[model samples]
Every structure is written in structure tokens, then in C-alpha cells.
Target: NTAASLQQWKVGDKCSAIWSEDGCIYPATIASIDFKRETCVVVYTGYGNREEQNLSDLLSPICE
Candidate 1:
């Protein structure tokens, strides 16, 4: 089951994000699916100038 009002994001899908200053959004893919929380963890490929963040925190939906 998916989260209420949360779109279903699948693995290997494209995720384009625009971040604010001191931050950068890059293409990422779903790494894990959390059925209990209805949130899939994502891991962004380090392809740009960005900060080092925990994989857990970096794990967010492409559209969330």
C-alpha cells in the first residue's frame, strides 16, 4: 500500500530536483521501499557539487 496522497515512485525511475543555495538536487533512484511508512528511500548519485548527507536523510521521493 502507498501513503495517502503519496504518489507511487518506483525504483530506477527518473527524479529531477531543484534545490536552494548551498544545496544541489540531482538525479536519484529509489533504493528501498518502506511499506509501513509508505516512503521509499533514495540514493542520489554523486554527480554534482553537493553536501555529504546521510543516506537515510537523502532518501526522499522524487516528487515529495
Candidate 2:
């Protein structure tokens, strides 16, 4: 299902993102993947913002 891609998403791909506990889902793309932290950085489109995320902690990345 959606399990595999969470940790293996490629950068600059179109996808949906949610912030921590706020449950704010929006259009965004991956900024980078962190090997050390096992996280990712995503750039928010509507807000023009970026975030470093612990994929396991928060975020179910769905790219199309």
C-alpha cells in the first residue's frame, strides 16, 4: 500500500504533505531525504514554506 514510498520518495516530486498534529494537508514536494534522521524535507506550495520531517513521526507522502 502507502507504506513503502514513505521512506523512499524522490525529491521534487508532486505530492501531498501534512504538518505535525495540525493535520494541514497541502500540495508540496520533497526537498531532500535525511539518511541520518530517516526523515525528509518538503517544500510547501501554497504557503511557500519548507519543513524537515521525521517520516515515521509524521507524514504519509503521496506523490503523483
Candidate 3:
């Protein structure tokens, strides 16, 4: 399925997040999300960095 489904993510869902600093995509997981804005606080895999991103920037890596 694609993001066009308008489906939001749940906690612990693996994702590919756009890094603001390096402007590149990286592996991440949903640490949390804000209900009001639908912004996700995703944590980069093993990078110890976290960011608040929109679902548009946070894409699914692989879905079954």
C-alpha cells in the first residue's frame, strides 16, 4: 500500500525519514506522534537523533 491511503503510522512502525541536516533519507521508527498535527517524532536508527516530521516526509520503507 502507498501513503496515498491517508493512513497514519503507529508507534514502532519502521520508516524512512528525511533528515533535515544532511537532506537525505534514513531508517527510523515512530517514537511517537501528535494527534493534533499528525506529526511524528521519529528516531533515526542507531543515530541517537530524533525529529518531528510530517507523514509526507516520513515514508514507509517496506510494507506487507
Candidate 4:
């Protein structure tokens, strides 16, 4: 299940997230995944901003 996979992002995995307002993709590290909300909490690598984003908002870059 895609939903299952999306919620499986583990801490220390490298990923990307698209900014909804800017349409830009940013690098991030998976800090956690919220199974209940289907969201992934990430810390942006570029600016170090921690944000909780829906799984649909994330892009797979590489998994560590």
C-alpha cells in the first residue's frame, strides 16, 4: 500500500518536500512519520526548519 509506504519513512532518511506556495523542492531529513495523519515530520536541510508535511507533499530522494 502506498499509504503504508509513505508512513514508513524512518528517522535519518533523506528526502525532499515541495513547497506548496513556491513550487520548489527542498532537501530534508525524515525526523519522524505520523501514522495517524499520514504526515512526515522533516527538518529542511537548506534552512533547518522543522515542518510536518503530508506524505503527498514529500518526494523520495534517497533513503538512509
Candidate 5:
């Protein structure tokens, strides 16, 4: 299988989120994943704001 297609996200994963409000990106944590919508719910580490974000908009740590 293609490595890209095999990539998956789960709760408790740390990520960087692109915050559109101020055009800034910050560290966040994955709270949940919506497979149907291809989105993940993330909580900003600084503000603790919970929001739904597109999976592509979040960056995860490289797993070896």
C-alpha cells in the first residue's frame, strides 16, 4: 500500500494546527478524528480552544 494512503491519525496524537483566525499555526493535540468528514478535533495547547480542523491542515510528527 502507498505510504501516503496508509497514514492514519488517532486521539492523543500531537500536532501543529493552522489557525486561520490570525493566520498563525500553533501546537495542538488531537482530541478526536471524524473519518466520515476527514477531519480531526483539536484543542489548542495555549488556549484550550476546541475546534474541528481539516486533517490536511494539521501536521503530525513523523513516525519511523
Candidate 6:
């Protein structure tokens, strides 16, 4: 349960995207923010499913 909230965001965050449908982590970035869409535009930094894992599925949040 370590999904990064869209609000805890920056433009260049290196993220492991939990695909909305599959909950898998393909290497991705917080490409941009869409105020109209209310979503952080994610860009794949690597390949697709079977190549990565979901950070939220694998880790725990550490409070700083």
C-alpha cells in the first residue's frame, strides 16, 4: 500500500505506475499535470506489464 498520491506530486517524479486496470508497475514519470483532467499525466519510462511491478503493491509508505 504505497501508492503515491497525485497531490504529493512534482513534474519529474520517477514513479512506478500502478496501471489503473492491472495494478502493475511499469517504469514511468509524472510527465505532466492536467488540471482539467484532474490527473497526473504519466509517461512510461520502460516497457509494459510483465516487465515491472507496482510500488504500492510491494512497499510501505515511510512518513518523513
Q: Who wins the lDDT comparison? A: 3
Expressed as tens digits, the lDDT of each residue in 1-64 for candidate 4 is 4453433467778888766557677888878888688887888886888788777667786453
lDDT of 1: 0.47
Overall local distance difference test of candidate 4: 0.74
**Native-to-model Cα distance after best TM-score fit, residue 30 in candidate 4, in Å:** 0.9
Per-candidate TM equals: 0.41, 0.61, 0.78, 0.68, 0.74, 0.48
lDDT of 6 by residue, 1-64 (tens): 4244424555666665566667654556666655555556566655532223322332222221
lDDT of 1 at 11: 52
* Global lDDT of model 3: 0.80
| Residues 1-64 of candidate 2: C-alpha lDDT, one tens digit per residue | 4564445566676556776457677666778877678877878766778887655544444554
Off by over 4 Å in 4: 1-7, 62-64
Task: Write model 1 residue lDDT over 15-43, tens digit each, in one string.
Answer: 54333343566656556656566555555
Q: Which number leads on TM-score?
A: 3
- Sorted by lDDT (best first), the order is 3, 5, 4, 2, 6, 1
lDDT of each: 0.47, 0.66, 0.80, 0.74, 0.76, 0.48
Clashing residue pairs, backbone N/CA/C < 3 A, model 6 = 25-53
Judged by whole-model lDDT over C-alpha atoms, candidate 6 comes out at 0.48
Clash pairs for candidate 4: none
Off by over 4 Å in 1: 1-6, 17-24, 47-64
Q: Which stretches of model 2 miss by more than 4 angstroms?
A: 1-7, 56-64
What residue runs in model 5 are displaced by over 4 Å at the alpha carbon? 1-7, 61-64
Better of 2 and 6 by TM-score: 2
> RMSDs, each prediction?
7.7, 3.6, 3.3, 3.9, 4.6, 7.1
Judge candidate 5 at residue 30 and give its lDDT.
90
> Of the pair 4 and 5, which is ahead by TM-score?
5
Model 2 clash pairs are none
